[PDB]
Amino acid sequence: FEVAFLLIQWYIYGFSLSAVYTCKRDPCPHQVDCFLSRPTEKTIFIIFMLVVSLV
Amino acid sequence: FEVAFLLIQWYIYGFSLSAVYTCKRDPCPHQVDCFLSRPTEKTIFIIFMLVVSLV
Ligand SMILES: CCCCCCCCCCCCCC
Ligand SMILES: CCCCCCCCCCCCCC
Ligand SMILES: CCCCCCCCCCCCCC
Ligand SMILES: CCCCCCCCCCCCCC
Ligand SMILES: CCCCCCCCCCCCCC
Ligand SMILES: CCCCCCCCCCCCCC
Ligand SMILES: CCCCCCCCCCCCCC
Ligand SMILES: CCCCCCCCCCCCCC
């Protein structure tokens, strides 16, 4: 259960977060720019919870 | 002067007007949709002034 939950997160998300996202869904016209909330503080806590599950 | 002014308008504009324009300049992000004012009434008067200059 520890290995299987680490492989789903590597496939879906990765292990960081960027500040600007580019979205191509509907009803939005062509492509839009969207901005995230605290993308640097969240990246620090993603790496803290990776080392805990590897130990 | 009548022929030279008809060839510049055929090259720049054409002889009609559409309702939705797609713009790719700066500072706009990617591509946006822009909407014109009375695009059908103006197309009727573009063709009236074409027949006058051809007669
Ligand atoms: C151990 C509990 C995890 C259950 C896994 C079931 C599959 C999860 C979906 C797989 C991702 C699909 C993305 C297209
Ligand atoms: C955008 C720059 C992010 C910098 C990431 C720094 C992460 C430090 C986390 C320390 C984890 C160590 C656990 C013992
Ligand atoms: C320069 C940006 C680096 C971002 C990742 C930093 C990770 C360093 C911390 C590793 C902790 C390992 C503890 C065993
Ligand atoms: C952007 C991703 C950076 C990942 C760097 C951290 C890797 C963790 C290595 C140390 C793990 C300690 C296991 C005991
Ligand atoms: C008879 C007066 C017309 C003057 C014509 C001078 C050239 C006009 C510009 C040509 C179009 C350039 C588009 C790139
Ligand atoms: C979008 C549909 C536009 C229909 C254009 C109709 C143009 C009629 C103009 C008549 C010109 C005749 C001059 C004698
Ligand atoms: C179906 C849309 C047709 C649009 C153009 C119509 C132009 C017809 C009028 C031509 C006038 C010619 C008078 C000599
Ligand atoms: C969308 C453009 C339609 C143009 C149709 C009208 C062409 C004009 C033909 C009649 C001209 C009369 C000259 C004497």
UniProtKB/Swiss-Prot annotation, chains A, B:
UniProt note on tissues of expression: Expressed at intercalated disks in the heart (at protein level). Expressed in the fetal cochlea.
Post-translational modification: Sumoylated with SUMO1, SUMO2 and SUMO3, which may regulate the level of functional Cx43 gap junctions at the plasma membrane. May be desumoylated by SENP1 or SENP2.
Domain of life of the native organism: Eukaryota
Annotated disulfide bonds: C23-C34
Location within or outside the cell: Cell membrane; Cell junction, Gap junction; Endoplasmic reticulum
Intervals, Extracellular compartment: 13-43
Function: Gap junction protein that acts as a regulator of bladder capacity. A gap junction consists of a cluster of closely packed pairs of transmembrane channels, the connexons, through which materials of low MW diffuse from one cell to a neighboring cell. May play a critical role in the physiology of hearing by participating in the recycling of potassium to the cochlear endolymph. Negative regulator of bladder functional capacity: acts by enhancing intercellular electrical and chemical transmission, thus sensitizing bladder muscles to cholinergic neural stimuli and causing them to contract.
Family statement: Belongs to the connexin family. Alpha-type (group II) subfamily.
Annotated disease: Oculodentodigital dysplasia: A disease characterized by a typical facial appearance and variable involvement of the eyes, dentition, and fingers. Characteristic facial features include a narrow, pinched nose with hypoplastic alae nasi, prominent columella and thin anteverted nares together with a narrow nasal bridge, and prominent epicanthic folds giving the impression of hypertelorism. The teeth are usually small and carious. Typical eye findings include microphthalmia and microcornea. Oculodentodigital dysplasia, autosomal recessive: A disease characterized by a typical facial appearance and variable involvement of the eyes, dentition, and fingers. Characteristic facial features include a narrow, pinched nose with hypoplastic alae nasi, prominent columella and thin anteverted nares together with a narrow nasal bridge, and prominent epicanthic folds giving the impression of hypertelorism. The teeth are usually small and carious. Typical eye findings include microphthalmia and microcornea.
Subunit structure: A connexon is composed of a hexamer of connexins. Interacts (via C-terminus) with TJP1. Interacts (via C-terminus) with SRC (via SH3 domain). Interacts (not ubiquitinated) with UBQLN4 (via UBA domain). Interacts with SGSM3 and CNST. Interacts with RIC1/CIP150. Interacts with CSNK1D. Interacts with NOV. Interacts with TMEM65. Interacts with ANK3/ANKG and PKP2.
Protein name as it appears in the record: Gap junction alpha-1 protein
Source organism of the structure: Homo sapiens (Human)
